[PDB]
DNA sequence: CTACCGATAAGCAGATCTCTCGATTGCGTAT
DNA sequence: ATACGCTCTCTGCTTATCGGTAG
RNA sequence: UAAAUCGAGAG
């Protein structure tokens, strides 16, 4: 639960929602 | 005892010619290998007292120097017959450099340069002026056993060096701008001297020191 | 370390800076006001050094994160010092800057042109252009020529920086090597030495009183001489409070921002934060989390932490000076007797000096007065400190120590271990 | 023979014969101290030590004053006089990239020497 | 699973103080069933500086595979055969095995078939991987009739044959050992060790062969067969000598310490001649002629004058020390090994002192001949105010024994005065030992703190942690110190050409290299250097740089340093010897390519350790304080500056002695015999009479004439005198 | 969303400049002792975590021995990123390098 | 106070005596052996001030 | 030890059948290497062995006060004549046989009777092994002391030796991985180690990690709202990530913030 | 005559490997 | 029975003050 | 459970 083996380290949006 | 002064001046003149020749300007070995009696005949009057106005001379870059360093200009070597350097002599020397448009002129004094005269050395860019005591040139430092061969690199070879090792100008080993060899070669801040160092374990190998 | 617990992030670099008084007031979970650590029945009294908002303490859940002693990381509080007090670390440079200042025009006693020249040289050194720094000195040829000289120097510096950046050499974050660091240190030393060598200001030529630091905790300024007083007319000993020093240096730093942007920054200041004289004054102390101030115990013998003693002394002095301030404030609305004002003001000055000495003792033991309790500095400086004793050399797990005996029939690359070590020492083998 | 005047003083030779002569003098003087005791130490170590002492064109020592100029604040702090170096690093707002071997220990990172002088990449077969 | 430590785990062993990196190694774990001590092989004691006098050390257990591979490959104890300080080995059998091999490799060592085979199997067990061929191969006996006998040299030969890998030639080494041929009788050649085709054919195996010593059998095996084979050979030799000592024991006793009747007679006759040494030395120092009786009043007066001075008594204690040491040397030369009752190899004291197993020649000299002069900080025994060196000696006694010359020996004991002097010497030794350790740690700390970041980069240049360049190439040749031991051992590499060719193997290293460009550039540079290099160094214009500057030595075969190339050419020229010079030069160039220092090497740490750790063993400043001047302080104000001046062959020593007097300073006080001040007050008067030495005296000693002295007095002396007088009056007006 | 894309493009372009192309690498063709040691250590760590194995385990239980066996046969799927002091780097697969 | 002096070795005097050192004046009679015990009554110290010294004369 | 400074630890308790045995049937209870005497020069031990054997044979005691013998009457002569009058040889050697092979040794063996002392330095007082155990409170490193199950110290002089080997992972395993390794949360934007904290969720929510410094008090400002035990509601400060550091780093950051110094750590993946 | 550039005499700071045991830990009024 | 205030250094740098220049 | 100081030791 909430580990680097489960959740992404960093998540960023590349483009605006479409 | 005046013979001792004559001999010291002869040695200083020889070392100044050697310095000019090493800097890349055209000086023939006839001038360098000057016998003492020939020097006395050429530069001492009937009384035998040398005059330092005739010792001043001019030098021009060689063909190879112009090929390698295109930016070089004429050099003017001045001796001061006066036992001291004042404001009058230094400013006159600067104006003499300017009016003939010399790219570099090196000053040789006898005892000391007045601090009011020392203010005019960096006065006129780009033509730099260098100061050398006569007593500091009686023996050529570069002829010493411990000192290696210093060869100032051209801009293209400096590019090649800083490209091969992927360096900034500052990451190189530094040689002080006021240490005797840098004054000898006439190093201006920024350019690299290659040093051919004789090693106890590897023989000849090349180092590089930038002047800053 | 557990190889089955990867860490996705990594620290790439660290940078040093002053912890401003505004931010600590925001990060803090609680401030401490009562210099009593724990009340009767052994419970930690709220608002004291051991507060449940500063971390779980002795089987009491932390009031901040709600976690027990094992899982509470700890939280930092602060002390609202009644007056700004000198930071003992920065006191020497603050004393350098206080001298060589013109109280009238709020500039340095050195002329503005030379100061601008040094600022340009320092900014050139920020990008590693040590070559151009000396070429800047070759620009020297009343009151309007100096402005043109400054404009041309600024243009030359900008041109050099732009060319060097564009000529594949430097990026936005500058080049910082050892040699450029040495040149910057030499230039800044010459700058500071030159500031200390002045007679009077060169923008309004009035003499300024000569300060004198007797020791820490006190700065004494001599009065202006009679003959020097005359010039302040023709151009138209004493103790000094910490607030007056702060105001003087705040005004000076506000005036000379363009020059101190390059004395307090070795690299391009991308954040564009102004350099403030408040950085030299610790208006608010920061108390560490109680996890780092726990009391020592040996059976019955229980002793409180020394840092707690220093902070309690600071709080006691703070309450004393606050009481004196209230006593003055009541008379401010209705003044009765100036002699009572005299004695209360003498007590207030003594309180100022005492609280400054308390701060000095809390940070640096050798800067205290009146064997003593070590400060924060004394915990890091020498051997048995924190760098040489707990960072460069640590104590380790899974290690044994024993007296050796010789053994042939050992393969000269082997070590013969006892059965006890073979039973205690272990290796984590993942099952496959 | 004025061209062969070698001197025990490793600073006057720097003053009159420049940097490299001083470096050679450093090597030779740090050599014959081991020659008296008949101790074999290769000139490769002595050469590096001399080159490090004279890297700035001057005669630097191995002490706090000699190390006064360096990019890594953690090294100078950990050596001695931690608080003076800390004040100098915080007033200059210095930022260190954790490149010294001592700097990476404070933060807890893999070293930049030997096995830490490179990275390891996996070749995953499927894009 | 947090499993227990096993036999396949590695462990980091360290013993404080960790002066050099070899004092912290990685060992493969073997767990023993009995006792609570860390059991360590004897060869590891060389690097840890560890005895078994209750010494303790630390075992660390790495907890991940990354630190496992480091200790098994980088901190591995097999990789630590050669110390990086100078490339000398620091591993080998120490004390019992050396004497065991001196006995075993003697000519008297004959072993029957059962003994030979049992000795061979006692160390090369072919089930622990000790041998290669899966079957212990033996040798035909040296003697076939009357009955089969082998030899100890054959035991060594078959040990090497079993440990050395097959499909490879045997070792070929011509070396020497520590025992002179005169200790084996007339016509012996056992001082020269000769391995041919992997067979010991001559000489004795010694400390210089197996042990921390260069160019021995173990060093050669390490260089030719690799480090693992050398470690295996060390283990096998240790087991072999252990099993030989358990069946053929070694002992030392009181019989080994005795001299014959003639030896004692020689010693007494020589020592009787020392009854006049001290008096003669004193007469020399006191300038009395000779034969002067010890109680000559003038001699006593001048001896008392000498004692009161720390410099004159410093030469008295140096002149007498030389004579008594000469007497000691005569005694030792005469009385060993000639005067010994038991001779080498039977005399085990000499057996283990000559072979290097333990002790020295001075130890056996003290045991058997005399202790000799006792030196207190370079001087003799201190003297009381009364002039007595001890209560039992009359004041200013001109005796060698009075000054601290012990004629006794540890075999027959020493007299109470000699006992006291020896106690002084031993106490001084202990004080120096205690003070030396504390005097060296700070130097290594200072060096390590700054040099810790310096390392070799993948540009093959070495530079600091933040990137600042320090050197362009390690030493100018990029050669590892621990891999250049046999680079210039050209005859050794020739004699083992095929063995080295099996490992270097150029046939597999051609697809990933450039072979001809570096060789061509080297040829050009060598030709130009030979054409030039008769003129001074400043005149030589550098048209061609050394090949290391342009071509990477790790990527271009033939790019080697100029010294190595010149030595290789000289070797290939001097002697012409199925190996031709072309293949040999190719092999040597490939060996140079493989002898380079790897990028990432902690070169600065290694240099700091190699300057600090050897500093533990430690008119002009000399020793560790001198280092303190150079590295730690960089003192421009050197304590004792000196300057060296060459001399033209034209000048003569008569001129030379006078030139040194024309530069040396001469104070005015050096010529004044005396000063007389005649003060008569009532204005104050003074007659400052100055009486000089005779003009012929100072005009010769200092070459100072009357005119120069008088001018100095008129101009310099009186000005300083008046200034000092005015200053004193000014400061005395209070 | 747009600031992050600019940051990503800047970082990827700066990394692309650092990478020395495969035909310009001038470092040693051999594998250094440190490189071999860390290759073995990392491969052993991977194998210990149920990584696919490209060699036959002749009754071996030590992951480090499995890594050594794969290194002998040059079946290790790893890449060494050698770093120059400037920050530019070179990529060498284990197959390209030659041990000792 | 005499018991304190014996049990700590500190010499607490408002008017310091002619002696130099101020601590380490009493030693525990270890009584590990009889040699160890009898040695305590025949050993004389130069003074603990000389223990913190660089010279060895 | 003996009375001549020949100290040494026991290595193996040699079974009596494996010990060398003499012509009289006895085997020694102490074996001391002959390679200890030549460099130490403890001839007193040799002559004491001689005198002890002579006295035990004759049932007497020999005085050994120094300076009773001379260079004329060497003690070797005196005790050798005493040994010879009892049958044994003049030099104190005895013919012994190896207890393993059973054959006679190459030469006679020097054996006698000497006085041996047992020193008070046992191994049970000196051996120590730690896998895990108690830790120091403010550094989370192993404690000091054998009696407290504390770890041993890897100081700077071992740190530089580990650097010299080039073993970077050994240095990380000693100094970091197994001394005070911890995974601390760092605020990615403010770059501070100790300014982060957990959250006190509602019943049904999940406690996350938030930063005091990089958050706004909700009064001055529903997926960014977090609360602490005190109840003061905050918004933001949700940009934090785990980083592996020593705990002494956190302690140093705290002590530095006590000085007014702020350390900002830049994490790589942003 | 007066202000800048050094040039010493004097003052001041930090500083000169690991490990194991035991023993003590303050007094001085004020209430 | 009991609580709160305290007499034998090595290397520099850094400071104060003394002359000379030239302004 | 802690810390100094003193004292005693080991390599
Ligand atoms: Zn909490
Ligand atoms: Zn003003
Ligand atoms: Zn934050």
For residue H256, how far is its CA from the centre of ligand 1 (angstroms)? 20
- Beta carbons of C92 and H263 less than 8 angstroms apart: no
Do H174 and H142 contact (CB within 8 A), yes or no? no
**Do residues B177 and C144 lie in contact, with contact meaning Cβ atoms separated by under 8 Å?**
no
End-to-end Cα separation, chain D, in angstroms: 75
Q: Rounded distance, CA E610 to CA E607, Å?
A: 5
Instruction: Report the chain D residue with the minimal C-alpha distance to residue F42.
Output: D120
- Three-state DSSP class for residue B199: strand
| G47 phi and psi angles, rounded to 5 deg | 130, 135
Biggest alpha carbon distance in chain D?
Answer: 76
CA angle D87, D92, D93 (to 5 degrees): 95
Q: Which of H229, E592, E147, E439 is nearest to G55 (CA)?
A: E439
Q: DSSP labels for E411-429?
A: TTB--HHHHHHHHHHHHHH
The rounded distance, in Å, linking the Cα atoms of E124 and E239 is 9
B1-139, superfamily in CATH?
Answer: RNA polymerase, Rpb5, N-terminal domain (3.40.1340.10)
Picking from C399, C410, C418, the nearest residue to E35 by CB comes out as C418
Indicate yes or no: strand K within 7 A of the C-beta of E433. Answer: no
CA distance E628 to E446: 11
Beta bridge partners of B107: B78, B131
CA distances from E513 to D104, E179, E478, E508, E593 (A): 37, 48, 18, 11, 11
Nucleic strand J under 7 Å from the C-beta of B116: yes
Query: Which residues, other chains included, contact B12 with Cβ-Cβ below 8 Å and sequence gap of 6+?
Result: B108, B134, B135, B137, B138
Dist. CA D31–CA E471, nearest whole Å: 19
Q: How far is A4 from chain C (nearest CA, A)?
A: 7
What is the spatial distance between Cα C283 and Cα C260, in angstroms, rounded to a whole number?
Answer: 22
Across the interface, do C12 and H242 touch by the CB < 8 Å criterion? no
C431, burial (CB in 10 Å: exposed 0-12, middle 13-18, buried 19+): exposed
Cβ distance E370 to E271 under 8 Å? yes
Q: Which method resolved this structure?
A: cryo-EM
CA-based torsion, C155, C156, C159, C160: positive or negative: negative
Rg for chain H, CA atoms, rounded:
36
C62 assigned binding-site residue: yes
What's E456's DSSP letter? E
Are H166 and F33 an interchain contact pair (Cβ–Cβ within 8 Å)?
yes
Of C64, C363, C395, nearest to H151 by CB-CB distance is C395
* CB < 8 Å to H236, chain C: none
Q: Which ligand is nearest to the CA of H216?
A: 3
G3 touches strand J (CB under 7 A): no
Instruction: Count other C-beta atoms under 10 Å from residue D11's C-beta.
Output: 18
Residue C27 phi/psi, 5-degree rounding, is: -70, -25
How far is H239 from H200, CA to CA, in rounded Å? Answer: 17
Taking the CA atoms of residue B2, residue B7, residue B12 and residue B16 in that order, the dihedral angle to the nearest 10 degrees is 130
Matching residue, tokens 């000019």: B20
Q: Chain D to chain F, count of Cβ pairs less than 8 Å apart?
A: 40
Residues, CB-to-ion distance under 5 Å, ligand 1: C 55, 62, 64-65, 72
What six digits make up the tokens of C13? Answer: 């670099």
State whether residue F10 sits within 8 Å of chain C by CB: no
CA torsion, ordered H49, H52, H57, H60, to nearest 10 deg: 160
What does the block give as tokens for E235? 């283990």
Neighbour tally for C71: CB within 10 Å: 11
User: Which nucleotide is closest, CA of C388 to its C1'?
Assistant: I17
Compute the CA torsion angle H99, H104, H107, H110 (nearest 10 deg).
40
CB burial of residue G20 (10 Å; 0-12, 13-18, 19+): exposed
Strand pairing report for B203-211 and B174-175? parallel
CA gap C429, E1 in Å, rounded: 5
Distance in Å from I19's C1' to H153's CA comes to 10
Residue H202: how many other CB atoms lie within 10 Å: 7
Structure token pair of residue F96:
């390209």
Q: How many CB atoms lie within 10 A of CB B166?
A: 16
- Strands of E192-196's sheet in order across: E173-176, E192-196, E199-202
Q: How far apart are alpha carbons D86 and C387 in whole angstroms?
A: 12
Q: How many Cα atoms occupy the beta-carbon half-sphere of E271 within 13 Å?
A: 20
**Structure-token pair, residue H270:** 């942003």
What HEC string does chain C produce?
A: CCCCCCCCCCEEEEEEEECCHHHHHHHCCCECCCCCCECHHHCECCCCCCCCCCCCCCCCCCCCCCCCCCCCCCCCEEEECCCCCECCCCHHHHHHHHCCEECCCCEECCCHHHHHHHHHHHHHHHCCCHHHHHHHCCCCCCCCHHHHHHHHHHHHHHHHHHHHHHCCCCCCCCCCCHHHHHHHHHHHHHHHHHHCCCCCCCCCCCCCCCEEEEECCEEEECCCCHHHHHHHHHCCCEECCHHHHHHHHHHHHHHCHHHHCCCCCCCCCCCCCCCCHHHHECCEEEECCHHHCCCEEECCEEECCHHHHHHHHHHHHHHHHHHHHHHHHHHHHCCCCHHHHHHHHHHHHHHHHHHHHHHHHHHCHHHCCCCCCCCCHHHCCCCCCCHHHHCCCEEECCEEEEEEEECCCCCCCEEEECHHHHHHCEEECCCC
Distance CA E164, CA C151 (A): 82
From ligand 2's centre to the CA of C102, what distance in Å? 5
DSSP E340: B
Q: Are E476 and B202 in contact (CB under 8 A)?
A: yes
> Residue E400 in contact with residue E278, Cβ under 8 Å?
yes
Instruction: Please give the span between the terminal C-alpha atoms of chain H, in angstroms, as a whole number.
Output: 67
Q: Which residues contact E237 (CB under 8 A, 6 or more apart)?
A: E93, E97, E101, E123, E159, E210, E218
> Are E80 and E47 in contact, with CB atoms under 8 Å apart?
yes
Inter-residue contact C359 to C81 (CB < 8 Å): yes
Pick from E552, D44, E461: nearest CA to F30: E552
Residue F38 has its nearest CB partner, among D115, D123, D125, at D115
Burial (CB count within 10 angstroms: exposed 0-12, middle 13-18, buried 19+), residue C391: buried
Nearest to E457 by CA among F17, D99, C213: D99
Domains annotated for chain F, with CATH where assigned, are 15-100 (3.90.940.10)
Task: Establish whether the CB of E16 is closer than 7 Å to any nucleic acid atom in strand K.
Answer: yes
- Six token digits for residue H171: 């240095």
Kindly list the strands in the beta sheet with H261-267, ordered across the sheet, starting from the edge strand earlier in the chain: D95-96, C11-18, H261-267
E495 assigned binding-site residue: no
Compute the distance between CA of residue B118 and CA of residue H185 in angstroms, rounded to an integer: 62
Q: What is the resolution of this structure in A?
A: 3.2
| Closest CA-bearing residue to C1' of I14 | D81
Distances (CA, A) of C171 to C125, C165, E520: 14, 6, 42
Count Cβ neighbours within 10 Å for each residue of B53-74 and write b for 16 or more, e otherwise.
eebbbebebbeebeebeeebeb
Residue among E185, E162, E178, E171 nearest E223 (CA): E171
- Alpha-carbon distance E453 to D111, whole Å? 10
In angstroms, the CA E577 to CA F23 distance is 42
Q: What Rg value do the Cα atoms of chain G yield, rounded? A: 14
Report how far apart, in Å, the C-alpha atoms of H112 and of each of B188, H13, H78, H92, H109 are. 84, 20, 15, 7, 10
Query: Phi-psi region for residue B186, left (φ > 0), alpha (ψ -120 to 50) or beta?
Result: left
What is the rounded distance in angstroms from the CA atom of residue E625 to the CA atom of residue E442? Answer: 12
Q: Number of residue pairs across B and C with CB atoms under 8 Å?
A: 27
Angle at B188 between CA B187 and CA B192, to 5 degrees: 65
Relative to the alpha carbon of C205, which ligand is closest?
A: 2
Measuring CA to CA, which residue among H213, H214, H212 is closest to residue H230? H212
User: Which chains contact B through at least 3 pairs of Cβ atoms less than 8 Å apart?
Assistant: C, D, E, F
What residues have CB less than 8 Å from H63, skipping those under 6 apart?
none
Nucleotide nearest to C306 (CA to C1'): K3
d(CA B133, CA B107): 8
- Answer positive or negative: Cα dihedral of E287, E293, E294, E297: negative
In whole angstroms, what is the distance from residue B105 CA to residue E284 CA? 67
Strands, E, within B84-156: which ranges? 104-109, 128-133, 149-152
Residue D117's CB: how many other CB atoms inside 10 A?
A: 26
CA of C235 to the centre of ligand 2 (A): 11
Show the beta-strand stretches assigned E in E571-629. none
Strand I and E449 CB separated by under 7 Å: no
Total length of chain B: 212
CB of G52 lies under 7 Å from some atom of strand J: no
CA of H184 relative to ligand 1 center, distance in Å: 14
* Rounded Cα–Cα distance for residues A1 and B82 (Å): 91
Question: Which nucleotide is the nearest neighbour of D65, by CA and C1'?
Answer: J12
- CB neighbours of B133 closer than 8 A, spacing ≥ 6? B108, B109
CATH superfamily of B140-212: RPB5-like RNA polymerase subunit (3.90.940.20)
Chain K positions with a protein C-beta closer than 7 Å: 1-8, 10-11
Q: Which of C241, C383, C358, C250 is nearest to C307 (CA)?
A: C358
Spatial neighbors of H147 by CB under 8 A, at least 6 apart, are none
Coil, strand, or helix at residue F90? strand
In Å, what is the CA distance from C264 to each residue of C170, C267, D88, E23? 21, 9, 10, 45
Q: Please report which residue ranges of chain B form alpha helices under DSSP H.
A: 2-22, 29-32, 36-43, 63-68, 87-99, 115-118, 155-164, 180-185
Closest CA to B123 of B86, B78, B79, B93: B93
Q: Read off φ and ψ for residue E295, nearest 5 degrees.
A: -100, 35
- For H69-90, give the secondary structure using H, E and C: CCCCCCHHHHHHHHHHCCCCCC
C72 in a labelled binding site: yes
At D84 the three-state DSSP class reads helix
Nucleotide J7 C1' to residue H255 CA (A):
39
Q: Does H270 touch chain F (CB under 8 A)?
A: yes
Q: What's the rounded Cα separation, in Å, for the pair C373 and E663?
A: 61
E and H in touch (3+ CB pairs within 8 angstroms) = yes
Answer whether E373's CB lies under 8 Å from E328's CB.
yes
Judge whether residue H133 contacts strand K, using its CB and a 7 Å cut-off: no
Give the distance, in angstroms, between the CA of residue E380 and the centroid of all CA atoms in the same chain: 27
HSE-CB at B144 with a 13 A cutoff on CA atoms is 26
Q: Domain limits of chain B?
A: 1-139, 140-212
Beta strands in E485-569 (DSSP E): none
CB E124 within 8 A of CB E130: yes
The answer, yes or no, to whether B and E have at least 3 beta-carbon pairs within 8 Å is yes
Contacts of E579 by beta carbon, 8 Å cutoff, 6+ apart: E494, E497
């Amino acid at each position: 639960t909430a580990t680097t083996l489960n959740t992404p380290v960093v998540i960023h949006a590349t483009q605006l929602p479409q | 005892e005046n013979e001792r002064n004559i001999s010291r001046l002869w040695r200083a003149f020889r070392t100044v010619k050697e310095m000019v020749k090493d800097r890349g300007y055209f000086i023939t070995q006839e001038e360098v290998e000057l016998p003492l009696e020939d020097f006395k005949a050429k530069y001492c009057d009937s009384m035998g007292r040398p005059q330092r106005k005739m010792m001043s001379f001019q030098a021009n870059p060689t063909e190879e120097s112009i090929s390698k360093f295109p930016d070089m200009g004429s050099l003017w070597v001045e001796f001061c017959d006066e036992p001291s350097v004042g404001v009058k002599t230094m400013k006159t020397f600067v104006i003499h450099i300017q009016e003939k448009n010399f790219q570099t002129g090196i000053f040789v004094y006898q005892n000391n340069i007045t601090p009011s005269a020392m203010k005019l050395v960096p006065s006129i860019p780009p033509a730099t002026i260098e100061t050398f005591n006569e007593a500091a040139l009686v023996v050529n430092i570069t002829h010493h056993e411990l000192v290696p061969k210093h060869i100032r690199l051209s801009s293209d070879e400096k590019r090649e060096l800083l490209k091969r090792y992927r360096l900034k100008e500052s990451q190189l080993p530094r040689i002080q701008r006021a240490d005797p060899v840098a004054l000898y070669l006439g190093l201006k801040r920024g350019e690299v001297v290659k040093i051919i160092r004789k090693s106890e374990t590897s023989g000849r190998y090349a180092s590089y020191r930038i002047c800053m | 370390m557990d190889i089955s617990k990867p860490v996705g992030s990594e620290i790439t670099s660290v940078d040093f800076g002053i912890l401003t008084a505004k931010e600590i007031r925001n990060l803090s979970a609680k401030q401490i006001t009562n210099p009593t650590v724990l009340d009767n029945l052994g419970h930690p009294v709220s608002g004291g050094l051991y507060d449940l908002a500063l971390g779980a303490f002795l089987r009491n859940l932390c009031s901040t994160c709600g976690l027990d002693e094992k899982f509470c990381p700890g939280h930092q509080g602060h002390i609202e010092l009644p007056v700004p007090c000198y930071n003992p670390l920065f006191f020497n440079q603050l004393y350098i800057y206080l001298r060589a200042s013109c109280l009238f025009c709020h500039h340095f006693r050195l002329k503005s042109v030379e100061v601008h020249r040094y600022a340009c040289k320092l900014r050139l050194l920020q990008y590693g252009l040590i070559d151009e720094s000396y070429k800047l000195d070759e620009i020297t040829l009343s009151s309007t020529l100096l402005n043109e000289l400054k404009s041309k120097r600024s243009e030359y510096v900008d041109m050099a920086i732009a060319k060097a950046l564009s000529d594949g050499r430097t990026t936005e974050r500058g080049s910082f090597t050892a040699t450029v660091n040495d040149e910057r240190k030499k230039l800044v030393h010459e700058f500071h030495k030159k500031l200390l060598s002045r007679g009077k200001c060169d923008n309004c030529g009035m003499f300024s009183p000569k300060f004198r630091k007797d020791g820490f905790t006190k700065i004494f300024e001599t009065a202006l001489n009679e003959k020097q007083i005359t010039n302040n007319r023709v151009k138209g000993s004493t103790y000094i409070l910490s607030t007056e020093v702060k105001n003087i240096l705040d005004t000076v730093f506000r005036k000379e921002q363009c020059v101190l942007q390059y004395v307090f920054h070795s690299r391009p200041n991308l954040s564009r934060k102004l350099v403030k004289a408040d950085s030299f004054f610790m208006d608010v102390l920061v108390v560490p989390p109680t996890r780092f101030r726990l009391p020592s115990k040996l059976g019955e013998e229980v002793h409180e932490n020394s840092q707690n003693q220093l902070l309690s002394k600071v709080l006691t002095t703070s309450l004393l000076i606050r009481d004196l301030n209230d006593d003055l404030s009541k008379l401010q609305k209705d003044k009765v007797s100036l002699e009572d004002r005299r004695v209360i003001f003498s007590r207030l000055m003594n309180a100022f000096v005492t609280i400054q000495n308390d701060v000095n003792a809390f940070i640096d033991s050798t800067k205290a007065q009146g064997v003593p309790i070590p400060g924060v500095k004394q915990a890091l400086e020498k051997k048995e400190g924190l760098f040489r004793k707990h960072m460069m050399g640590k104590r380790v797990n899974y290690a044994a120590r024993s007296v050796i005996s010789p053994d042939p029939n050992i393969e000269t690359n082997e070590i013969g271990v006892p059965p006890v070590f073979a039973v205690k020492l272990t290796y984590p083998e993942p099952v496959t | 023979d004025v061209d062969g005047i070698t001197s025990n003083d490793v600073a006057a030779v720097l003053k009159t014969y420049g940097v490299e002569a001083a470096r050679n003098t450093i090597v030779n003087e740090i050599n014959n101290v081991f020659s008296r005791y008949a101790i074999s130490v290769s000139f490769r170590h002595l050469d590096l030590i001399a080159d490090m002492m004279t890297r700035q064109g001057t005669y630097l020592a191995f002490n706090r004053q000699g190390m006064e100029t360096s990019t890594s604040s953690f090294m100078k702090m950990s050596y001695e006089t931690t608080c003076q170096f800390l004040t100098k690093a915080v007033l200059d707002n210095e930022r260190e990239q954790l490149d010294s071997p001592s700097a990476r220990i404070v933060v807890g990172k893999l070293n930049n020497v030997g096995t830490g002088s490179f990275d390891v990449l996996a070749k995953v077969p499927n894009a | 699973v947090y499993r227990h430590i096993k036999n396949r785990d590695v462990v980091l062993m360290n013993r404080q103080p960790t002066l050099h990196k070899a004092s912290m190694m990685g060992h493969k774990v073997r767990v023993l069933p009995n006792e609570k001590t860390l059991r360590l092989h004897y060869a590891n004691t060389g690097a840890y500086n560890a005895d078994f006098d209750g010494d303790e050390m630390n075992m660390h257990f790495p907890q991940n595979e990354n630190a496992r591979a480091e200790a098994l490959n980088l901190a591995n104890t097999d990789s630590q055969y050669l110390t990086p300080t100078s490339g000398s080995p620091v591993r080998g059998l120490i004390q019992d095995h050396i004497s065991a091999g001196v006995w075993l490799t003697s000519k008297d060592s004959f072993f029957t078939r059962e003994q030979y085979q049992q000795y061979i199997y006692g160390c090369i067990r072919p089930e622990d991987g000790h041998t290669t061929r899966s079957k212990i191969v033996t040798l035909p006996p040296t003697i076939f009739k009357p009955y089969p006998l082998w030899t100890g040299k054959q035991i060594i030969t078959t040990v090497l044959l079993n440990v050395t890998p097959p499909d490879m030639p045997g070792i070929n080494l011509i070396s020497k050992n520590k025992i002179k041929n005169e200790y084996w009788g007339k016509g012996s050649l056992e001082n020269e060790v000769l391995f041919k085709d992997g067979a010991l054919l001559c000489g004795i195996l010694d400390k210089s062969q197996y042990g921390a010593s260069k160019y021995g059998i173990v060093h050669s095996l390490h260089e030719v067969y690799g480090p693992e084979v050398a470690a295996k050979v060390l283990s096998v030799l240790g087991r072999l000598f252990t099993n030989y000592i358990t069946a053929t024991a070694f002992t030392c006793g009181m019989d080994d310490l005795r001299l014959t009747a003639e030896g004692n007679k020689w010693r007494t006759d020589i020592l009787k001649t020392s009854v006049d040494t001290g008096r003669e030395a004193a007469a020399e120092v006191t300038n009395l002629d000779k034969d002067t009786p010890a109680d000559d009043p003038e001699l006593l007066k001048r001896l008392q004058e000498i004692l009161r001075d720390n410099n004159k008594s410093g030469i008295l204690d140096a002149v007498t020390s030389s004579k008594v040491n000469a007497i000691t040397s005569q005694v030792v030369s005469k009385c060993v090994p000639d005067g010994t009752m038991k001779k080498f190899p039977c005399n085990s004291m000499q057996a283990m002192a000559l072979s290097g197993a333990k002790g020295s020649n001075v130890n056996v000299s003290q045991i058997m001949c005399l202790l000799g002069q006792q030196a207190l900080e370079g001087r003799r025994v201190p003297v009381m105010v009364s002039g007595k060196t001890l209560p039992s000696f009359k004041p200013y006694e001109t005796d060698a024994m009075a000054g601290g010359y012990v004629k006794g020996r540890f075999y027959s004991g020493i007299k109470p005065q000699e006992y006291y002097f020896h106690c002084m010497a031993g106490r001084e030794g202990l004080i120096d030992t205690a003070v030396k350790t504390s005097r060296s740690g700070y130097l290594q700390r200072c060096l390590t703190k700054q040099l810790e970041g310096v390392h070799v980069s993948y540009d093959n240049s070495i530079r600091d942690a933040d990137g600042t360049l320090v050197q362009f190439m390690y030493g100018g040749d990029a050669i590892d110190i621990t891999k250049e031991s046999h680079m210039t051992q050209f005859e050794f590499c020739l004699d083992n050409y095929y063995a080295l060719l099996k490992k270097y193997n150029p046939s597999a290293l051609i697809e990933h290299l450039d072979v001809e460009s570096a060789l061509k550039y080297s040829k050009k540079t060598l030709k130009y250097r030979k054409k030039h290099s008769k003129e001074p160094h400043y005149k030589q214009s550098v048209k061609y740089d050394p090949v290391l500057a342009k071509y990477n030595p790790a990527k271009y075969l033939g790019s080697v340093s100029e010294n190595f190339q010149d030595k290789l050419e000289s070797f290939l020229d001097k002697n012409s010897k199925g190996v031709n010079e072309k293949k040999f030069r190719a092999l040597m160039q490939l060996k140079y390519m493989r002898s380079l220092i790897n990028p990432g090497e902690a070169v600065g740490i290694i240099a700091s350790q190699s300057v600090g750790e050897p500093s533990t063993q430690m008119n002009v400043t000399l020793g560790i304080p001198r280092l303190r001047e150079i590295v730690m302080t960089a003192s421009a104000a050197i304590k004792t500056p000196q300057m060296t001046l060459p001399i033209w062959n034209d000048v003569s020593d008569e001129q030379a002695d006078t030139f040194c007097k024309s530069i040396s300073k001469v104070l005015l006080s050096e010529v004044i015999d005396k000063v007389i001040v005649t003060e008569t007050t009532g204005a104050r008067s003074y007659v400052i009479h100055m009486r000089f030495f005779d003009n012929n005296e100072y005009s010769e000693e200092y070459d100072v004439s009357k005119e120069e002295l008088q001018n100095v007095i008129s101009n310099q002396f009186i000005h300083l005198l008046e200034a000092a007088i005015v200053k004193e009056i000014k400061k005395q007006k209070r | 969303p747009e600031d992050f894309q600019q940051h990503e493009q800047i970082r990827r372009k700066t990394l692309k400049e650092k990478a020395i192309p495969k035909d310009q690498r001038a470092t040693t063709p051999y594998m250094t002792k440190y490189e071999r040691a860390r290759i073995l250590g990392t491969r052993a760590l991977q194998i210990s975590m149920n990584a696919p194995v490209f060699v036959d385990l002749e009754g071996e239980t030590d992951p480090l021995r499995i890594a050594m066996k794969e290194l002998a046969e040059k079946k290790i799927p790893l890449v060494i990123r050698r770093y120059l002091p400037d920050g530019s780097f070179e990529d060498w697969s284990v197959e390209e390098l030659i041990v000792d | 106070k005499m018991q304190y002096f014996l049990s700590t070795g500190n010499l607490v005097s408002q008017s310091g005596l002619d002696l130099q050192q101020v601590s380490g004046y009493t030693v525990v009679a270890e009584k590990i052996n009889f040699y160890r015990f009898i040695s305590h009554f025949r050993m004389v110290h130069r003074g603990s001030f000389f223990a913190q010294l660089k010279t060895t004369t | 030890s003996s009375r001549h400074g020949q100290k040494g630890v026991c290595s193996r308790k040699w079974p009596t059948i494996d010990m060398p045995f003499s012509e009289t049937g006895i085997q020694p209870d102490i074996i001391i290497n002959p390679h200890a005497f030549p460099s130490r020069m403890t001839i007193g031990m040799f002559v004491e062995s001689l005198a002890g054997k002579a006295g035990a044979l004759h049932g007497i005691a020999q005085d050994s006060t120094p300076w009773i013998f001379n260079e004329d009457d060497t003690p070797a002569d005196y005790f050798g004549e005493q040994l010879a009058k009892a049958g044994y040889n003049y030099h104190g050697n005895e013919p012994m046989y190896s207890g393993a092979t059973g054959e006679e040794l190459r030469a006679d063996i020097y054996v006698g009777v000497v006085y041996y002392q047992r020193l008070r330095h046992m191994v049970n007082d000196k051996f120590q092994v730690r896998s895990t155990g108690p830790v120091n409170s403010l550094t989370m490193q192993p404690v000091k002391g054998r009696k407290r199950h504390g770890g041993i110290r890897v100081g700077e002089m071992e740190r530089d030796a580990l650097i010299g080997h080039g073993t970077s992972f050994l240095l990380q395993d000693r100094l970091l991985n197994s001394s005070d390794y911890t995974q601390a949360s760092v605020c990615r934007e403010c770059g501070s180690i100790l300014t982060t904290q957990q959250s006190v969720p509602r019943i049904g929510s999940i406690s996350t990690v938030c930063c005091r410094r990089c958050s706004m008090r909700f009064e001055d400002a529903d997926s960014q709202i977090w609360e602490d035990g005190q109840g003061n509601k905050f918004v933001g400060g949700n940009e934090t990530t785990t980083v592996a550091i020593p705990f002494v780093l956190k302690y140093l950051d705290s002590e530095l913030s006590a000085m007014g110094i702020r350390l900002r750590y830049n994490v790589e993946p942003k």
